[PDB]
Amino acid sequence: MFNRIMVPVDGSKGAVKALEKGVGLQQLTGAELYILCVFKHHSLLEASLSMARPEQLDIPDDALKDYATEIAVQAKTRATELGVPADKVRAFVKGGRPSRTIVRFARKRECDLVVIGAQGTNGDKSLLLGSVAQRVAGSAHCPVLVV
Amino acid sequence: MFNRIMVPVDGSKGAVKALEKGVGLQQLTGAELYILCVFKHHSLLEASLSMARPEQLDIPDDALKDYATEIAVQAKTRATELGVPADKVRAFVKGGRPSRTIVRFARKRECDLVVIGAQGTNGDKSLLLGSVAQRVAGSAHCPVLVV
Ligand SMILES: Nc1ncnc2c1ncn2[C@@H]1O[C@H](COP(=O)(O)OP(=O)(O)OP(=O)(O)O)[C@@H](O)[C@H]1O
Ligand SMILES: Nc1ncnc2c1ncn2[C@@H]1O[C@H](COP(=O)(O)OP(=O)(O)OP(=O)(O)O)[C@@H](O)[C@H]1O
Ligand SMILES: [Mg+2]
Ligand SMILES: [Mg+2]
């Protein structure tokens, strides 16, 4: 019933648990699995700042992209090791606002399911939905499996 | 991968779409399907009030329960229409706070999936995640498919 399953991943343990359920559903349906990691742009952060960040807090401009890439590749590799055929899994890295970017990606690529962690890099003992999960679950055009 | 799927229903169009996806997954897995409609009982509706509700709005608990029962029974009927074996689908009606009652029921009954509408009786064109959906997705012990 699901032909193209999207798993947004952020390098968190919550996202890995989401990926694992995505893999289970992939095996049940034979769907394509699309993995996406969104990274924040330098501009989007400092655009909404009153004063500039000190140059002591500087990072390479492509360092966030490289990190997102490693995360997406970890996820792809894990998915294939867990039994998803390599030709069914595709990994992507996109710059931008996570919730916005995830929902746009899901619509553009005609994904019929998004599988997302309940919590992410800011996870805790709380049973509150992470901000990205909350926004994606609300705004996605397709069903959203919160894991 | 899902042996016991729960669909909380509230009589909304959003809940109907949730049921339809729950049935789809039931047919794929041969899972048991547990349908639950929660009614807010009289003490709960009157719990945090600065003034009593007027007579015409004071609907007694037996009538609130009867409405929930009708909804749950219709959902079971509709599930069977769409392919689910009668013996695999059970309807439940419970009094209490919906979010908390749904989460507790999933845990007690050992459900491994909850399928819930993104929106409910207050649903509209907007992309706001429903309050019950938000709370269930955050607090459920198992994955929550928000449709
Ligand atoms: N940048 C991102 N790229 C891809 N997926 C993401 C990204 N951020 C979050 N997610 C997805 O959303 C899930 C929930 O993460 P979310 O960011 O909502 O929670 P959190 O970080 O713990 O809380 P908050 O961000 O509100 O402090 C993650 O497990 C992941 O699946
Ligand atoms: N009393 C209930 N019993 C069982 N399931 C419910 C109940 N209320 C809501 N649900 C489930 O939650 C889904 C989302 O409904 P929710 O009440 O969260 O949104 P809403 O009514 O549109 O918005 P809000 O109530 O936040 O203004 C419904 O489609 C249904 O599956
Ligand atoms: Mg986060
Ligand atoms: Mg509601």
From Swiss-Prot, chains A, B:
Record-level GO cellular component terms: cytoplasm
Organism lineage string: Bacteria, Pseudomonadati, Pseudomonadota, Gammaproteobacteria, Oceanospirillales
Molecular function per GO: ATP binding
Role noted for this protein: ATP-binding protein that negatively regulates activity of the tripartite ATP-independent periplasmic (TRAP) ectoine transport system TeaABC. May regulate uptake according to the ATP status of the cell.
Cysteine disulfide partners in this protein: none
Gene3D superfamilies: HUPs
Subunit structure: Homodimer or homotetramer; in equilibrium. The dimer/tetramer ratio is ATP-dependent. ATP stabilizes dimer-dimer complexes, with one ATP molecule bound to each monomer.
Organism domain of life: Bacteria
Keyword terms of this UniProt record: ATP-binding, Cytoplasm, Nucleotide-binding
Protein name: TRAP-T-associated universal stress protein TeaD
Positions with a binding annotation for ATP: 8-10, 38, 117-122, 131-133
Pfam family, one: Usp
Induction description: Cotranscribed along with teaABC.
Location(s) in or outside the cell: Cytoplasm
Species the sequence originates in: Halomonas elongata (strain ATCC 33173 / DSM 2581 / NBRC 15536 / NCIMB 2198 / 1H9)
Family: Belongs to the universal stress protein A family.
Chief location category: cytoplasm
Disruption phenotype: Deletion results in an enhanced uptake for ectoine by TeaABC.
